[model samples]
Target: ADIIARLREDGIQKRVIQEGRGELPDFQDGTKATFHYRTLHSDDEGTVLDDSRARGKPMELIIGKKFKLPVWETIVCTMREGEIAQFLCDIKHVVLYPLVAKSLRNIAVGKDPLEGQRHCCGVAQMREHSSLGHADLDALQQNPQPLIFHMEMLKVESPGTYQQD
Candidate 1:
């Protein structure tokens, strides 16, 4: 059976793991989306990059917001509440993974995510730092590789329901 639902020109391939219940709402601006994700290298069982579930918190993003990872927003907009999906993103799409991981790792350690960005204005500074403070992410930065993101949609709320910082 072909598991691929759609393959885009940017090298993003998506597959639905489970169908969701309830109506599929429009992913309009100002809406908040909540989900847990496990990012892996190459395939679903590949080297784990990041796991929101393991971190004990779901990641939330606002619709139409240009977050650091556009690849995530692109695939996430297609999901419905309670839906489980996976997206395979190529190296081109994951070029900024190291920068993102650095911030998240800092947050995990109770340090300011931007602790080292005091004198920088762009990603170049973050990239120049060499280490993302994590072995797995450092390896990924050195070797650009495709990644698979496994995600489960937990909920979606209108703008007024929640406040975004």
Candidate 2:
């Protein structure tokens, strides 16, 4: 398959859907980005696992903030403002996603995201047998799998442009 061959290179494959107006922005350590995304099953893109739009708010990230999914930072850095792209990230690249999803899901229900950090680290979480509470996420934690991210870059704010994180 196309994605299979592509994944061998770096475990990250990108497909551009819509081009942005200008060149790729200057991605520094502190640039703020706003984007919408859909997380899909690798084998079947139609099987969506998560959607930022469904929550009625896009996701925000501060570059170099050590987000749970660093693949998101890598993917967004390669995009221009207003661009839309899909990325196929291998299981190895998203091994920590179950924890990340748990936190996000907790926030969705106005619960404390910190509740997800019962363990010390990703490896420790895997070593232990703590359940993620969500059925799908618990399954994913037991059997990590590749995932597809469909992202639309809505805006970018360079550092110094605003006092934002």
Highest TM-score scorer = 2
Whole-model lDDT for model 2 versus the true structure?
0.70
Scored against the true structure, residue 139 in model 1 reaches a CA lDDT of 74
Q: List the pairs of residues colliding in candidate 2.
A: none
Write the residue-wise lDDT of candidate 1 on 63-161 in tens digits: 765345566676777788999998787777778878866544444332255654343322333345454357777777666778878989989887667
Per-prediction tally of clashes: 0, 0
Question: What would the TM-scores of all predictions be?
Answer: 0.70, 0.71
Candidate 2, 101-161: lDDT as tens digits:
7554444332245654443322332355554557655657666677888889888888788
Regions of candidate 1 where Cα sits further than 4 Å from its true position? 1-10, 43-45, 104-132
